[PDB]
Amino acid sequence: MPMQMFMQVYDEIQMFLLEELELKFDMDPNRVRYLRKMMDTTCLGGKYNRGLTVIDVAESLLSLDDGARRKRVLHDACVCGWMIEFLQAHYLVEDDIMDNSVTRRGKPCWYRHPDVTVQCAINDGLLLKSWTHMMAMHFFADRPFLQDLLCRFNRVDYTTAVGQLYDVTSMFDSNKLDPDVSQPTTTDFAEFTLSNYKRIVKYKTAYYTYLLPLVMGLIVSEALPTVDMGVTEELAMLMGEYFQVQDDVMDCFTPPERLGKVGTDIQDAKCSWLAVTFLAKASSAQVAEFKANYGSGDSEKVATVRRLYEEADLQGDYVAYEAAVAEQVKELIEKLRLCSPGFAASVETLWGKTYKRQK
């Protein structure tokens, strides 16, 4: 049922976008055809956690009628859902390029498709982002909440690109960060700290993945101030950090077939949860062998890093991590429940889709 509606609104949105292109942007059938495939490939095939969370929060805050309100709020919630899913699609298109990934959701990355050049793919990503603004303006033209909705969406979007900068520069000595001078990947790994890890993940993931679906659900249902926002943000940040930790762990240990995408973290010398957690507790010997093997495409070097992780009991650390998180989450959810029972339930439901995801 939630999926049923969400996919009707996908049709509505696509229809509005591609037709507008044909009618007002002189677009030929072939390019409308290209863009329809692009849109389907890039936006569809995920679990839609972000999109569906907007619907669920809206519905939960509805009680605060001929049903006309319900029709309206839930349809606005579906559109906001797609705004975040299209924002996500944009990020993944560009991120697969930045990360030199090969596949995504069991398909080749968009930029890796035979008839998609890297240059078009960059622009297709840009198109994805612009469609978020185009759909909002079409559907929310007459809504009092439009300006606030767009202000917040835009803030989070900026936040996410700021986090991406943290991610993409995390393997380079920041003191030597300088446009005019080339610099290799870090050799001492001095900045692969848990502190620098939490900052990357808070900004690149937590805001758009957890805070924004919640905020949008609250905006469309006109209930944003009914909620302790300090507690709501604590929750989003924590759940968002945990989600990315899971993403990192899965990159290394989850078989590609379940994962859908091949893991690039070790080869990209990424500042992952695994690397920072290993380096903090490792012996000098272990640090040496890590440094000898990280950040190379070589297959046995990557298999050494995996053994080192297993030998250092990182799966054990993860279990302990997960348990600390779940306890914090539970405590914050009850704090929410006191004056926002409906919302706390939608947050519980979001947690259900996150906690111990086999994904």
Ligand X SMILES: CCCCOc1ccc[n+](CC(P(=O)(O)O)P(=O)(O)O)c1
Q: Which two tokens stand for residue 154?
A: 């835009």
∠ CA 261-9-204, rounded to 5°: 40
62 binds, among a copy of itself, Mg ion, ligand X, none (CB under 5 to 8 A by kind): none
Give CA separation, 266 vs 31, 152, 196, 242, in Å. 38, 34, 17, 19
Binding status of residue 50 toward ligand X by CB under 6 A? no
- Nearest approach in angstroms of CB 150 to a copy of itself is 7
- Nearest approach in angstroms of CB 199 to a copy of itself is 5
Binding status of residue 124 toward Mg ion by CB under 5 A? no
Residue 96 assigned ligand-binding role: yes
Lookup result for tokens 């348990």: 323
- When the beta carbons of 15 and 126 are compared against ligand X, the nearer one is 126
Residues 6+ apart with CB under 8 A from 48: 3, 6, 81, 85
Q: What is the Cα–Cα distance from 61 to 76, expressed in whole angstroms?
A: 13
Among 102, 126, 303, 339, binds ligand X (CB under 6 A): 126
Choose the binding region for Mg ion from 3-11, 61-69, 87-95, 230-238 (rule: CB under 5 A): 87-95
Give CA separation, 307 vs 182, 248, 278, 310, 329, in Å. 32, 16, 11, 5, 32
Among 14, 41, 53, 164, binds ligand X (CB under 6 A): 164
Among 5, 18, 62, 120, binds a copy of itself (CB under 8 A): 120
Q: Which two tokens stand for residue 74?
A: 């839930």
With both helix axes pointing from N to C terminus, report the angle between 212-220 and 341-352 in degrees, rounded to the nearest 10.
Answer: 140
- Sign of CA pseudo-dihedral 84, 47, 8, 63: negative
Binding status of residue 155 toward a copy of itself by CB under 8 A? yes
Among 3, 15, 161, 190, binds ligand X (CB under 6 A): 161
Binding status of residue 15 toward a copy of itself by CB under 8 A? no
Q: Could you give the 3-state DSSP secondary structure of residue 178?
A: coil
Lookup result for tokens 């090969």: 102
Binding status of residue 151 toward a copy of itself by CB under 8 A? yes
Name the DSSP class of 207: I
Lookup result for tokens 């991610």: 167
Residues 52-91 that bind ligand X (CB under 6 A): 91
Among 19, 28, 310, 327, binds a copy of itself (CB under 8 A): 28
Residues 280-309 that bind ligand X (CB under 6 A): none
Q: What is the Cα–Cα distance from 208 to 217, expressed in whole angstroms?
A: 13
Among 160, 232, 304, 346, binds ligand X (CB under 6 A): 160
Name the DSSP class of 202: I
120 binds, among ligand X, Mg ion, a copy of itself, none (CB under 5 to 8 A by kind): a copy of itself
Residue 268 assigned ligand-binding role: no
Residue 124 assigned ligand-binding role: no
- Sign of CA pseudo-dihedral 274, 280, 283, 288: positive
Name the DSSP class of 187: S
- Mind giving me the DSSP string for 213-279? HHHHHHHHTT-GGGS-HHHHHHHHHHHHHHHHHHHHHHHHHS-HHHHSS---TTTTT---HHHHHHH
117 binds, among Mg ion, a copy of itself, ligand X, none (CB under 5 to 8 A by kind): a copy of itself
Residues 280-299 that bind a copy of itself (CB under 8 A): none
Return binding residues: 95-96, 99, 167, 247, 251, 265
What is the binding site for ligand X (CB under 6 A)?
A: 91, 94-95, 99, 101, 123, 126, 160-161, 164, 204-205, 247
What is the binding site for a copy of itself (CB under 8 A)?
A: 21, 25-28, 30-31, 33-35, 37-38, 41, 94, 97-100, 110, 113-117, 119-120, 122-124, 126-127, 129-131, 133-134, 137, 146-147, 150-151, 154-155, 157-159, 161-162, 164-166, 168-169, 174-175, 177-183, 199, 202-203
What is the binding site for Mg ion (CB under 5 A)?
A: 95, 99, 247, 251
Return binding residues for Mg(2+): 95-96, 99, 167, 247, 251, 265
